Each structure stands twice: as C-alpha cells, then as structure tokens.
Amino acid sequence: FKLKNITDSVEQALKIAKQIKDDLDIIEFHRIKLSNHYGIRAEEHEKQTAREELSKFSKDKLEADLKKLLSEIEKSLNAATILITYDYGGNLQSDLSAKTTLEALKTEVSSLITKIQDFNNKDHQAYPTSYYQTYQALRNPYSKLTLVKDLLTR
Structure with a gap:
C-alpha cells in the first residue's frame, strides 16, 4: 500500500519527465528542417509540416508541464x-537515496520553472535545443526518476 503509494507517484513523475524529453526530440527534429543554415535540406512539404508541429509547443505548455x-x-x-x-x-539506504534524489529533483525542477518563466519567447522557441545547458537540465529529470524507480524496485 505504502510502497504502491510511493511507486505510483514516481511513475506519474517519470511519465511527465519522459514527455518533456520527447517534446524536446520533436522540436529539434522539426526545427532542423526549418533552419535556414543548419542540417540537411528538407523538401518544402517537410518545412510546412515542421511549422505546424512546432505550433503545438509554447512557453506556457512547458511551464504547465514542469x-x-x-x-x-x-x-x-x-x-x-x-x-x-x-x-x-x-x-534501507535504497529508500534513503530515493528520498535524497527526489529532494534534489524538486529544487532542480523549481529552479527550472523560475528560469523558464522569464524566457522572452512565448512560442516553441522557449524550448532550448542542442545545436545548451538548459536543454540538458530539462531532460535530466527523466534520468533521476528512472533511478528513483530502480531503487524502489526490489
């Protein structure tokens, strides 16, 4: 019951964290097609597809997610x-480390919220891409929660 309580919540955290990470993948993929000077030449229709996909993402969506x-x-x-x-x-030190990592995540995710709210782009450009620190910060939670899950699965 208590174990299910912790592990159910971690799983819900993991799911959103994985989302964020996948969202970065999607934006990077389509952005590179739209880039005037970076990456491989895309056909005009991929470029139009890219504009429409990129419009699904916003500063507010990212904040809400975080x-x-x-x-x-x-x-x-x-x-x-x-x-x-x-x-x-x-x-169990497994239990202790899980709590420890979770405490770390909380401040790291709070910091990232405070960081992102003052970005000036309201559109998909609020999301950083890797082509940089913030890019990495945004997808770190998935790794750490993937470890929290691992530690509580005995």
Missing part, C-alpha cells in the same frame, strides 16, 4: 517519508 512534474515529485517526497518512518532495525 508545474505538473513538480507536483508529482512533491507527492513522491511525501510518500517517501511515510515509507521511511514505516524502520526495521534500520532504514
């Missing part, structure tokens, strides 16, 4: 404390 991710991380923390207090001669 706020949702942060909420699931904070429910993950809470569930982690319950599981932690519920000691049998000593806490």
Whole structure:
C-alpha cells in the first residue's frame, strides 16, 4: 500500500519527465528542417509540416508541464517519508537515496520553472535545443526518476 503509494507517484513523475524529453526530440527534429543554415535540406512539404508541429509547443505548455512534474515529485517526497518512518532495525539506504534524489529533483525542477518563466519567447522557441545547458537540465529529470524507480524496485 505504502510502497504502491510511493511507486505510483514516481511513475506519474517519470511519465511527465519522459514527455518533456520527447517534446524536446520533436522540436529539434522539426526545427532542423526549418533552419535556414543548419542540417540537411528538407523538401518544402517537410518545412510546412515542421511549422505546424512546432505550433503545438509554447512557453506556457512547458511551464504547465514542469508545474505538473513538480507536483508529482512533491507527492513522491511525501510518500517517501511515510515509507521511511514505516524502520526495521534500520532504514534501507535504497529508500534513503530515493528520498535524497527526489529532494534534489524538486529544487532542480523549481529552479527550472523560475528560469523558464522569464524566457522572452512565448512560442516553441522557449524550448532550448542542442545545436545548451538548459536543454540538458530539462531532460535530466527523466534520468533521476528512472533511478528513483530502480531503487524502489526490489
């Protein structure tokens, strides 16, 4: 029950984090077709497809996504404390590290929200691409939650 509580929330966090990461993939893919000077020549129709896809993404979508991710991380923390207090001669260090990584994620995701809200582009250009630090910061949560999941799966 308590284990399901923690692991269900982590799974919900993982899902949004994976989304963010996939969203970066989509934007990069189509942006490179639209780029006047970078990447491989695309046909006019790929370029038109790119404009329409890129219009599905905005600064607000990204902020909303991060706020949702942060909420699931904070429910993950809470569930982690319950599981932690519920000691049998000593806490598993797997449990401790999970909580530790989660605490790290929370500040890192909060920081990224504060960072992104002051971007000036409202369109897809609020999303950084790798062609840079922020690009990496945005997809780090998936890795760390992938470790949180791994640690609680015994």
